[PDB]
Design a protein around this ligand. Structure first.
Ligand SMILES: Nc1ncnc2c1ncn2[C@@H]1O[C@H](COP(=O)(O)OP(=O)(O)OP(O)(O)=S)[C@@H](O)[C@H]1O
Ligand SMILES: Nc1ncnc2c1ncn2[C@@H]1O[C@H](COP(=O)(O)OP(=O)(O)OP(O)(O)=S)[C@@H](O)[C@H]1O
Ligand SMILES: Nc1ncnc2c1ncn2[C@@H]1O[C@H](COP(=O)(O)OP(=O)(O)OP(O)(O)=S)[C@@H](O)[C@H]1O
Ligand SMILES: Nc1ncnc2c1ncn2[C@@H]1O[C@H](COP(=O)(O)OP(=O)(O)O)[C@@H](O)[C@H]1O
Ligand SMILES: Nc1ncnc2c1ncn2[C@@H]1O[C@H](COP(=O)(O)OP(=O)(O)O)[C@@H](O)[C@H]1O
Lengths: 26, 121, 531, 189, 85
C-alpha cells in the first residue's frame, strides 16, 4: 500500500572555447 | 635524358622491390625555387610566421615514413641557395627543420632528373 | 537442469535433426575451433552484419559437433543459448549456478553481449566457462572499445555476405519455405535473375537475407496484382520495380533509352562544350556501365574554364538528367574549410547527406580554397574502401561521381595550364581520375540560344499578368555588341536584358496604359530600344 | 569480510599456482620495494607501454612476498587489486566511497592496486591520500601520464615513475624458452 | 552529529601525537593569530608557492593551542579540518 513518488533530476555539460593564434605575416 | 622514356618508372620499379610500396616515393618540383625569398619555403623556418602550421614541404614528408625515395623534378632551374641545402643532406644524414627537430635521411634514396638529351648522346 | 525455463538448448535439436542445410562458412568454423582451442586469448566473438546467419553458423557448428570430427578441447560441448527476452539479477544467481558445477561442458552462447557491460566478470577470468558471443562492429566499439579491463578475452572474427554465385545457388533449399499462400512456380530463370536484380530498389541492403526479402516482397506484389500459377523474369522485374519507380522508371539494360542521347537536354541548356559532350558521353558510357573497376565511385574527371562560361550552370544542367531530380547532386561551399579544425566537422555534414540520399553526384568546383587535409580524406575514398566517420556507420559511395571545374591555368593554353594543374595535385589525383578538357567560351554562333533561354525566362516572369513579347532577330543581334566580351562572361548580358528592357517596361507598367492582355514588341534603336 | 566482494585478491591466488612465472627482470622489484618502504612520497606508479609485463611485475612481487624475501617492514602484508571497468554523472563517487569502507576498516598496510589510474582523474581521495594508510600502487602509459595526471594533477608530488621500457630480443628468447612448458600443458607436442 | 562524519578533528589528533615537530616561523604565526581574533571578517588565507609548508603553520597553530601558548580569547578552541570531497 505504498506509493511511487517520482523524483526529479539535474543535468550539466559545459562548453568549450577556441583561440585564434595570429600570424606575424612576413 | 629525354621525356616519357620511363624516367620515373624506374623509381617505382624499385620503390616496391625494396620499400614494398607503390606509395613510397615522395616527389617534389624544383620549378618554383627561382626567387631568393621562397628558398626556405621548402623547410619553413620560424616559429611565429606564415609557414609554421603547414610545415616544411620537404621535411613533413620524411618525419613520418622515414623510408621514402625523393625525386627532384627539373633540378636545373633552381637558384643556388638550394645546392648547399642539397649538399648538407649528403654531408651528414640530418637536417634541422623549423620546429627544432632533427630528421634522419641516412636510409633514403635521392634521384635528380633533368630533360637535356636532345642532340648529343 | 533449472536453466530450461530460463534458456533454450542446442543438444536435443541437432540429435532430432531440425536443422537447416548449412552451406559454406567452413573457414569460419576453422577459425572458431582454432581460437576456442587456446590456452589464453580464447573464446572469440563473431562480428558480422545484422541479418547474416551467425545463428546458423553456430547451428552448423553444432551439426559438425554431433557428427564428430572435432579435436580434444571440443568434446561435444552441449551448448546453450540464453534467453535475451526474460530479464534484475534476482534470477541470475541461479542462472550462473548451473555454470558453476559445469566443467566447461555446458559452454553457453549469448547474443548481442554489448548489453552485458559486475556479475559475470570474475567467472569469466576464472576458467570454468567460455561464453562465445556475437555483436556488430559499430556496437562492438561503442560499449567495449574504451573499456580495456576485459578487451583481452575477446577476439573478433569478421564475417560478411557470401559471394553472389553461392548466394544465388544456395536458393535451391529455399523452394518450400515462405510460399504457403497461393503457390506460384517461382521460375529458375526468375530465381537466378532475382538476386541479380537486387540494386533496383536500393543497394544499401546486403546480399543473403535481402535476396529472400526481395523474393518475398516480389511474390507478395505478384499475387496481389494477379490476386497465373507461374512467374516471369520481366514480371518479377517490373514487380520489384513498383515502389521506388516512376512508372517503374528505368527498366532493363536501358543505355539505349536515355544514355545514348544524353545531350538533347544538356546541349539545349548549355550551348557549346562539344568535345566535352562527346567525352563525357563516352565517360559515362564506360564509367556508369560497371566496366570501370571494383568499389570506386567510378565517376572522376575534371575540366576548366574562367568566369561566365557557365561552370555552375553546366553542372546543374545534368542534375535533373542523371537521376532526374533536383536532389540528385551535392556541392560544397568550402569557404569555412581552411585548417585542421574544419576537418573535424564533416567527418558530420556530408556523411548524413549521403546516408539519407545514396543518390548524389558530388561537385568540387575550385581548389584554391581547399585545405590539404581534405585531399587525404578524399584519397581514402578512391580505391581504399568507402570512407570512415566519427561513430562508424559508414556509407558506400556506389552511385557518386567526382567532378572538378576549376579555372586553374586560365592563362595557359596547353603547356602552362597543365603545368599549373599537375603541380596542385598532392599525391594521386592525376592517374586516378581521367582526361582533362578545355572550355569553349563565348562565340558568335553559340550566342543566340543563350538569349533564347533568357527571353523564355523573362516571358515566364511576365505571363502571370497576361503580357507576352515579340522579339526580332535584329534586336537579338543588337544586344550581341554588349554581350560578347570573352573574359568576364555572359553576365552583363543577363544584366542588360533587365537594364534596357526593364526600366522602360517598369515605367510604362505602373502608370496604366499597358493594360492586361496586350503584347509588347521590340523596336531597335542604336543605343536604346523604346516601346 | 563485507567489502571484499567487488575486487580481487592477488595474494589469495598465490597459494594456488594461478599466476605465471616472472622470468628475468630482477631489478624493477628492487626499485619498487625500495620505494615502498619510504616515509613520504611513497606509492609508486609503473609507467610503460601496454603489453610489457607491469601486471607481471605486480605478480612476481606477490610471489616474492608469499615465499618471503622482502624486508620486515612489508612482511606478511596482503595485496588486493581493485576494479575500474565496471564503474561507469553520479554514483561513481558513491561506489568509490563505499569501496573506501574496508580500506579504512582494515587499519593496517593492506596494499591496493589500480590499473589505468589516469581514467579516474581528484579531490575525493587526497585528504585520505596524505595521511598514510593506503599504498596506491598503479599502472599507466607515458602519454596518458602526460594527459591526465599532468593536466588535472594538483597532487603530483605524491607519485613516482618507475620506468619499464621493454625487454630486448635476446632477453625475450631466454624468456620464451623459460616460458615453454606452460604450452606443453595444454596442447603439448 | 553532523560534523563528526564529514570532518576530522586535528585537536584530538594532536593529543595522541600524530603530528610533526614544527620549528620556526614566529612572524607568520602571530600574523595569523592577530587576524583570527578581530571583530568581523576574521578569516585568513595562507598564500604561497608550492612546497614551503603552508600546512605546517596550521599544525603548529594546533600544537600551540593544545600546549597553552595562545592569547586570551583562544582557550580550547578545537580546530576542525573539513572537506568537500
Ligand atoms: N553556356 C551557357 N549556357 C547557359 N547559360 C550560360 C552559359 N554561359 C553562361 N550562362 C549563364 O550566365 C550566368 C553565369 O552564372 P554562373 O553559372 O554562376 O556562371 P559561372 O561560370 O558559374 O561563374 P561564377 O563563378 O558562378 S560568377 C548564368 O545565368 C548562366 O546560366
Ligand atoms: N618477465 C616475464 N615473465 C613471464 N611472463 C612475462 C614476462 N613479461 C611479460 N610476460 C607475459 O606477457 C603477457 C602480458 O600480460 P600483461 O602483463 O597482463 O600485459 P601488460 O604488460 O600488463 O599490459 P596490459 O596491462 O594488459 S595493457 C603475459 O602473458 C605475461 O605472462
Ligand atoms: N617549520 C617546519 N617544521 C617542520 N617541518 C616543516 C616545517 N616547514 C615545512 N616542513 C615540512 O615540509 C613539508 C611541507 O608539507 P606540506 O606543507 O603539507 O606541503 P606544502 O608545503 O603545503 O606544499 P603543498 O602545496 O601542500 S603540496 C612537510 O614534510 C613538513 O614536515
Ligand atoms: N619505359 C617505360 N616503361 C613502362 N611504362 C612507360 C615507360 N615509358 C613511358 N611509360 C608510360 O609513361 C608513364 C610514365 O612516364 P614518365 O616516366 O612520367 O615520363 P617522364 O618521367 O619522362 O615524364 C606511365 O604511365 C606509362 O604509361
Ligand atoms: N550458410 C547458410 N546456411 C543456411 N542458411 C543460411 C546461411 N546463411 C544465411 N542463412 C539464412 O539466414 C537465416 C539465419 O540468419 P541469422 O543468423 O538469424 O542472421 P543474424 O545472425 O545476422 O541475425 C536462416 O534462416 C537461413 O535460412
Amino acid at each position: 500500500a505504498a506509493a511511487a513518488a517520482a523524483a526529479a533530476a539535474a543535468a550539466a555539460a559545459a562548453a568549450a572555447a577556441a583561440a585564434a593564434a595570429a600570424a606575424a605575416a612576413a | 635524358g629525354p621525356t616519357g622514356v620511363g624516367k620515373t618508372e624506374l623509381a617505382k620499379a624499385l620503390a616496391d622491390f625494396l620499400f614494398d610500396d607503390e606509395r613510397a616515393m615522395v616527389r617534389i618540383d624544383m620549378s618554383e625555387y627561382g626567387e631568393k625569398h621562397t628558398v626556405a619555403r621548402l623547410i619553413g623556418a620560424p616559429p611565429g610566421y606564415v609557414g609554421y602550421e603547414a610545415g616544411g614541404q620537404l621535411t613533413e614528408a620524411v618525419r613520418r615514413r622515414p623510408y621514402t625515395v625523393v625525386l627532384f623534378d627539373e633540378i636545373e632551374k633552381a637558384h643556388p641557395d638550394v645546392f648547399d641545402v642539397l649538399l648538407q643532406v649528403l654531408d651528414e644524414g640530418r637536417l634541422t627543420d623549423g620546429h627544432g627537430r632533427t630528421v634522419d635521411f641516412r636510409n633514403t634514396i635521392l634521384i635528380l632528373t633533368s630533360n637535356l638529351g636532345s642532340g648529343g648522346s | 537442469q533449472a536453466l530450461q525455463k530460463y534458456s533454450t538448448d542446442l543438444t536435443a535439436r541437432a540429435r532430432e535433426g531440425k536443422l537447416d542445410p548449412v552451406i559454406g562458412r567452413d573457414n569460419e568454423i576453422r577459425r572458431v575451433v582454432q581460437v576456442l582451442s587456446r590456452r589464453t586469448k580464447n573464446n572469440p566473438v563473431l562480428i558480422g552484419e545484422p541479418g547474416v546467419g551467425k545463428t546458423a553458423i553456430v547451428e552448423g557448428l553444432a551439426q559438425r559437433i554431433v557428427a564428430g570430427d572435432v579435436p580434444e578441447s571440443l568434446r561435444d560441448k552441449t551448448i546453450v543459448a540464453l534467453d535475451l527476452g526474460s530479464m534484475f539479477e534476482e534470477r541470475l544467481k541461479a542462472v550462473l549456478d548451473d555454470i558453476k558445477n559445469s566443467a566447461g561442458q555446458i559452454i553457453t552462447f549469448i547474443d548481442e553481449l554489448h548489453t552485458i557491460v559486475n556479475m559475470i566478470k570474475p567467472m569469466l577470468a576464472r576458467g570454468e566457462l567460455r561464453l562465445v558471443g556475437a555483436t556488430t562492429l559499430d556496437e562492438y566499439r561503442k560499449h567495449i572499445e574504451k573499456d580495456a579491463a576485459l578487451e583481452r578475452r575477446f577476439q573478433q572474427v569478421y564475417v560478411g555476405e557470401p559471394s553472389v554465385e553461392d548466394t544465388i545457388g544456395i536458393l535451391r533449399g529455399l523452394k518450400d519455405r515462405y510460399e504457403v499462400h497461393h503457390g506460384v512456380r517461382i521460375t529458375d530463370s526468375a530465381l537466378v535473375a532475382a538476386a541479380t536484380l537486387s540494386d533496383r530498389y536500393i543497394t544499401a541492403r546486403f546480399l543473403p537475407d535481402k535476396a529472400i526479402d526481395l523474393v518475398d516482397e516480389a511474390a507478395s506484389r505478384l499475387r496481389m496484382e494477379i490476386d497465373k500459377e507461374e512467374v516471369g523474369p520481366d514480371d518479377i522485374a517490373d514487380v520489384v520495380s513498383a515502389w521506388t519507380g516512376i512508372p517503374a522508371g528505368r527498366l532493363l539494360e536501358g543505355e539505349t533509352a536515355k544514355l545514348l542521347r544524353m545531350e538533347d537536354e544538356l546541349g539545349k541548356r548549355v550551348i557549346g562544350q562539344k568535345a566535352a559532350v562527346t567525352a563525357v558521353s563516352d565517360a559515362v558510357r564506360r564509367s556508369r556501365a560497371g566496366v570501370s573497376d571494383p568499389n570506386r565511385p567510378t565517376g572522376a574527371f575534371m575540366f576548366l574554364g574562367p568566369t561566365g562560361v557557365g561552370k555552375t550552370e553546366l553542372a546543374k544542367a545534368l542534375a535533373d538528367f542523371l537521376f532526374d531530380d533536383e536532389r540528385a547532386m551535392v556541392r560544397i561551399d568550402m569557404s569555412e574549410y581552411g585548417e585542421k579544425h574544419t576537418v573535424a566537422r564533416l567527418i558530420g555534414q556530408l556523411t548524413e547527406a549521403v546516408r539519407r540520399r545514396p543518390y548524389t553526384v558530388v561537385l568540387f568546383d575550385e581548389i584554391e580554397k581547399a585545405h590539404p587535409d581534405v585531399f587525404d580524406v578524399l584519397l581514402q575514398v578512391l580505391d581504399e574502401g568507402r570512407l570512415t566517420d566519427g561513430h562508424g556507420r559508414t556509407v558506400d559511395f556506389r552511385n557518386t561521381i567526382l567532378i572538378l571545374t576549376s579555372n586553374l591555368g586560365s592563362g595557359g593554353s596547353a603547356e602552362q595550364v597543365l603545368a599549373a594543374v599537375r603541380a596542385t595535385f598532392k599525391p594521386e589525383f592525376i592517374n586516378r581520375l581521367d582526361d582533362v578538357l578545355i572550355f569553349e567560351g563565348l562565340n558568335p554562333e553559340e550566342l543566340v540560344r543563350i538569349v533564347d533561354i533568357q527571353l523564355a525566362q523573362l516571358g515566364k516572369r511576365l505571363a502571370q499578368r497576361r503580357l507576352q513579347l515579340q522579339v526580332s532577330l535584329p534586336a537579338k543581334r543588337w544586344l550581341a555588341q554588349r554581350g560578347f566580351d570573352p573574359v568576364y562572361g555572359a553576365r552583363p548580358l543577363r544584366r542588360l536584358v533587365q537594364q534596357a528592357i526593364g526600366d522602360q517596361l517598369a515605367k510604362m507598367l505602373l502608370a496604366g496604359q499597358v493594360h492586361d492582355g496586350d503584347t509588347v514588341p521590340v523596336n531597335v534603336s542604336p543605343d536604346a530600344d523604346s516601346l | 569480510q563485507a567489502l571484499q566482494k567487488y575486487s580481487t585478491d592477488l595474494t589469495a591466488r598465490a597459494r594456488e599456482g594461478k599466476l605465471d612465472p616472472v622470468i628475468g627482470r630482477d631489478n624493477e622489484i628492487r626499485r619498487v620495494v625500495q620505494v615502498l618502504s619510504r616515509r613520504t612520497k611513497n606509492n609508486p606508479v609503473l609507467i610503460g607501454e601496454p603489453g610489457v609485463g607491469k601486471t607481471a611485475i605486480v605478480e612476481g612481487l606477490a610471489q616474492r612476498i608469499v615465499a618471503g624475501d622482502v624486508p620486515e617492514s612489508l612482511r606478511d602484508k596482503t595485496i588486493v587489486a581493485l576494479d575500474l571497468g565496471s564503474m561507469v554523472r553520479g554514483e561513481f563517487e558513491e561506489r568509490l566511497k563505499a569501496v573506501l569502507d574496508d580500506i579504512k576498516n582494515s587499519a593496517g598496510q593492506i596494499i591496493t592496486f589500480i590499473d589505468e589510474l589516469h581514467t579516474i582523474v581528484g579531490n575525493m581521495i587526497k585528504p585520505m591520500l596524505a595521511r598514510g594508510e593506503l599504498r596506491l600502487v598503479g599502472a599507466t602509459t607515458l602519454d596518458e601520464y602526460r594527459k591526465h595526471i599532468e593536466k588535472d594533477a594538483a597532487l603530483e608530488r605524491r607519485f613516482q615513475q618507475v620506468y619499464v621500457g621493454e625487454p630486448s630480443v635476446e632477453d625475450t628468447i631466454g624468456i620464451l624458452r623459460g616460458l615453454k612448458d606452460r604450452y606443453e600443458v595444454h596442447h603439448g607436442v
